[PDB]
Structures are given as C-alpha cells and as structure tokens.
C-alpha cells in the first residue's frame, strides 16, 4: 500500500533532511577521466575512485560561478535534497565534499547516456516506449511530491538511461522543499507551465504539466510548443492551444489534453484524486505500476555498453583542467554543503 510505503519513505527522508550528510570524500580519492556533460557553473566528469576501482559521475560546481548566477540557495537545495531521497528512478549520490574553489557531487555513473540523445537520434519513441518511461516519471513525482518536494526541471536532457534501460532522474538544481506556493522563474522554456510564465506563484502541478510536455516530446519527436526564441514559446504556451501528430492515439491525446491544461482546477495530477487520475487513465491501462516500481518490466531499449567506464553513449566535450585556488572561496555561503 502506497500510503504505508510513502509514510515510511517520508520518515527516512526527514531524518536525512534534518541531519544532512557532509564531507564524505575528497578530490584526490578519484582519477578524473572524461567530461560526460557540461553545465552552467561546471561540468560532470566520469571519474575512477582509487580505493574501490568503481566509476562515478563527478558533478563539479565552481562556487564563484554559482554565486555569479545567483544560484546559492538552489545549489544548497540540490545537495540537501539529493542526499536525503531514495527511489528506484532517482540517481544515487554516493559522495559529496567541497574545497577552496568547488563543490562536488559524486553520483552513480548512469552509463546509458541522456534520454535526449537517444530521442533525437531515433527521432521519436513508440507509445509503449514512451509509456514505459512516463510511468517511471509518474511514480517518481508521486514520491517527490509526497515529501513536499517540487522538481521543476523535467526534460529529456536530465533523464539518464541505466544499463537495464530504466530511467535515472538527475539534476535537482531547481528542486525545492516547499509547502504551498513558490515564485522563482526557473526551468526550461519549452517545459514551463503557463502559471510560471505569468508570474502567479505556483505549486507542484507545474511538474504534472512538464510531464505532459515530456510525454508529447517523447512520442512526437518534437515538443508541443516550440519557436526560435523563448518569447514566442511563451506565447504558445500561454495560448494552451496544442496540436498533435496524426499518429497519436486517441488515448494519448486525451491524457495530454488533461496534463497540458492551462486551468489548474482541471489539470490532471492536481485534482482531488491526485496522481490516481493519471495512473488510472486509459493510456496507462496496460501499465503494471507495481512491476515498474520493482523494475520487473522488460525495457524497450537497452543501451550498448562495453566496460564500466565506457562513455560511448555520451557526446564528447572540450576538456579543461580542474583548478583549485590556494584561497578559500565563498566559505560562509556554502558552510552547510
């Protein structure tokens, strides 16, 4: 029973939320091999942990760049939340630590690469294929939401595929523990809920909209609202008019009309039955929700992998040496990290 499950999951989370993990490794414990992806204030690298021999993904954040992009609280959020959560489709934070110059989050290496690359490469996913992924996101949002957590950055570029073909959600850069409404203008333009765009103050229903954009993009191969510049994206989103590819099933279209619903009183995930309206929708009728949580469902696609340190599922990136100053930067700001 979800209720009993979710209640012990909250008890677990709160213990760690209240007394966060800190300083559980150090930089010279790892050999840095290759950049797996880059980001706003740093990069993620494949690394090898010397004593164990295990590969990990090391997310390296330049403190100074974090401050310059005014992302201090969001970063503390990111780390405080990732060390406390635990769910089959959430990436595992194995270590965290900081030095004079950087913040480090060392995670399990998800060697499948981004959903993004396979989506663009294959073009689009079949509805069974997209439905397998969407179900994992639905369960993950149920989990997170039940902890008063809002994710706010759903998109293929943040969903990693593991060796069994299951999803691992990463980047909690915008995740927040909040009861009731919040106001930060953040996310990716194609995925923004209209209430974010119109600066109203919003709640976790923005994640259910984002799911709608995700399922569309997965099934269509392009997002429901696109343009060359975000302002035009924003007008389209605010319209709420949505057109669907001719191949979409009636079931899919119905679900998407209820997720990409500009009216919060109507948007699926936010009504009285909450997530069960989504779990019980016709599009999901063939979904075995328990078998998915227990990862018993055969995945539709299984990434090619060779050796635990293989990065062939990732784009190549320009490399830059990791500099650590002799002077501590932003020590007080990041004390709790």
């Amino acid at each position: 029973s979800v209720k009993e499950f979710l209640a012990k999951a909250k008890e677990d989370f709160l213990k760690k939320w209240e007394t966060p993990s800190q300083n559980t490794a150090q930089l010279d414990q790892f050999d840095r091999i290759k950049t797996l992806g880059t980001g706003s204030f740093g990069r993620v690298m494949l690394v090898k942990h010397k004593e164990s021999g295990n590969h990990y993904a090391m997310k390296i954040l330049d403190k100074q760049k974090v401050v310059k992009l005014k992302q201090i609280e969001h970063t503390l959020n990111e780390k405080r939340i990732l060390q406390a959560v635990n769910f089959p489709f959430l990436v595992k934070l194995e270590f965290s630590f900081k030095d004079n110059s950087n913040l480090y989050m060392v995670m399990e290496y998800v060697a499948g690469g981004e959903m993004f690359s396979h989506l663009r490469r294959i073009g689009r996913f079949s509805e069974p294929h997209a439905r397998f992924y969407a179900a994992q996101i639905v369960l993950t949002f149920e989990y997170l939401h039940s902890l008063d957590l809002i994710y706010r950055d759903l998109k293929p570029e943040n969903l990693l595929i593991d060796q069994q073909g299951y999803i691992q959600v990463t980047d909690f850069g915008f995740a927040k523990r909040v009861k009731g409404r919040t106001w930060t203008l953040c996310g990716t333009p194609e995925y923004l809920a209209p209430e974010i765009i119109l600066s109203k103050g919003y709640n976790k229903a923005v994640d259910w909209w984002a799911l709608g954009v995700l399922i569309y993009e997965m099934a269509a191969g392009y997002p429901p609202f696109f343009a060359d510049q975000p302002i035009q994206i924003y007008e389209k989103i605010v319209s709420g008019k949505v057109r669907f590819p001719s191949h979409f099933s009636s079931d899919l279209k119905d679900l998407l009309r209820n997720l990409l619903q500009v009216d919060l009183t109507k948007r699926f995930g936010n009504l009285k039955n909450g997530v069960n309206d989504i779990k019980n929708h016709k599009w999901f009728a063939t979904t075995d929700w328990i078998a998915i949580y227990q990862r018993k469902v055969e995945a539709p696609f299984i990434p090619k992998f060779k050796g635990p340190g293989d990065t062939s599922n990732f784009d190549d990136y320009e490399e830059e040496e990791i500099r650590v100053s002799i002077n501590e930067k932003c020590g007080k700001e990041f004390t709790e990290f």
Binding site: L69, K70, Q71, E157, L185, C186, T188, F226, A227, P230
Partner: peptide, 20 residues
Amino acid sequence: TTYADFIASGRTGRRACIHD
C-alpha cells in the same frame, strides 16, 4: 511539416535552463 520546421529550428540541441 511540423517535424521539418522543428529540425530546421535553432532549438534542437540540448536546451539550457532559465532562472534568477
């Protein structure tokens, strides 16, 4: 087609966020 318009667009690569 919508496909061709998307693929010819400037937003088919990895998308960057927005924030404060």
